[PDB]
Amino acid sequence: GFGCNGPWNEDDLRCHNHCKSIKGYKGGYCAKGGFVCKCY
Description:
It is classed as antimicrobial protein. By secondary structure, this protein is an alpha+beta fold.
C-alpha cells in the first residue's frame, strides 16, 4: 500500500513521502516486488 501496489504500480516516492511524513521516520521505500511500503 501507500504507493506500493505491486510491480505494476510502484510509487516508491509516494511511500517515501508517506513515511517521511510520519514523525519517527526519515523516509520509506517499496519492498517485496513493490508491494510493501516499508519505512525507515
